[PDB]
Structures are given as structure tokens and as C-alpha cells.
Amino acid sequence: GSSGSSGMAILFAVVARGTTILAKHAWCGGNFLEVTEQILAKIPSENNKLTYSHGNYLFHYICQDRIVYLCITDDDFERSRAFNFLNEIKKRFQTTYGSRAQTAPPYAMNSEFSSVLAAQLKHHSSGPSSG
């Protein structure tokens, strides 16, 4: 009996082009890079989105400029919210680290982004109960 239900908000969120992960940054909890990587290898590179309900969760992925933005969220969590946040950072990445995302090597701009995302996540939702 080990269940924890408190404040449902985005926890995992990384950016990868097809199957190559550039900048990854998720909350300290478990291993999501596993299910995520597997899903990525399944998601095409063509501009198209779709809601994938895996592991009793919702995997919202938005393909753009050969970049896939996946994020793990609770079922209850609304879609608009998920898609929203993703769009925010998504545009921020392609706007700032966009060009590099096409040239720059993998795990190159993970630091800079890692921090940026962390802020967006903590802000978006008051998971840690911060204000």
C-alpha cells in the first residue's frame, strides 16, 4: 500500500528530434526515460500530434521542425494545460535553441534548457507548493 495522490501536474518533459534526445529534464521520482524512449521510436517525424494513453497516463507529443515534445501527465490533468505548456517551451526552444536543434549534437544544450524547463514546470504548476 504505497500510493501518493497530491496535486496533479506535469512531471516529465523532454525534447527530442525523432529518436535523438537533445535536452532532457524531469522531476526526481522514477524512470520515465524508458517508456519515453520506446514511444519516441514509434512517433514519426511528420508534423502531426496525437494523445497516447499509456501507463494510465497521457503522453502529449507535438511534432514541429523535426522535434517531438513529449510530456507525462496525469489522466485527470486537462489537455489544454498540457498542450499549452508544451507549446510555450516548444516555441522557446525552436526560437532560441532551434537552429542548433538541427545541427548541434545530442546532449549539447541540456544544461541551459534543463534549467529553463525546471522553471517553467515549477511555475506552471505549484507541485512543490511554491509561489
Side-chain angles (χ1 to χ4, degrees):
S2 307
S3 305
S5 291
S6 276
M8 300 300 109
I10 303 150
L11 302 167
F12 196 88
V14 310
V15 173
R17 60 203 197 66
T19 35
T20 300
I21 307 169
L22 297 155
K24 64 166 179 61
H25 171 104
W27 280 71
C28 193
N31 195 317
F32 273 134
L33 193 65
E34 172 179 281
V35 76
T36 298
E37 273 209 40
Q38 299 279 37
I39 294 278
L40 289 170
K42 290 162 210 200
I43 301 167
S45 66
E46 282 73 51
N47 69 293
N48 191 85
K49 65 188 151 85
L50 164 156
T51 311
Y52 210 131
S53 51
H54 204 77
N56 278 312
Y57 270 55
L58 306 177
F59 285 56
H60 323 274
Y61 84 82
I62 304 168
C63 206
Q64 194 69 356
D65 208 322
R66 307 275 205 280
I67 313 295
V68 180
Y69 303 72
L70 194 150
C71 84
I72 295 156
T73 74
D74 193 38
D75 78 291
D76 187 89
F77 203 73
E78 206 47 87
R79 278 170 204 182
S80 300
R81 286 162 84 75
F83 284 119
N84 196 49
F85 156 86
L86 290 171
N87 207 335
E88 286 270 77
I89 51 176
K90 173 182 88 188
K91 289 202 90 188
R92 276 209 168 204
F93 183 83
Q94 58 195 244
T95 287
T96 305
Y97 312 132
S99 292
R100 272 197 184 84
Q102 305 304 283
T103 57
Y107 303 112
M109 67 271 251
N110 59 310
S111 295
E112 279 72 284
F113 210 57
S114 161
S115 60
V116 175
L117 283 166
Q120 292 301 266
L121 270 150
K122 210 184 206 160
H123 202 139
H124 198 260
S125 279
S126 186
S129 199
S130 61

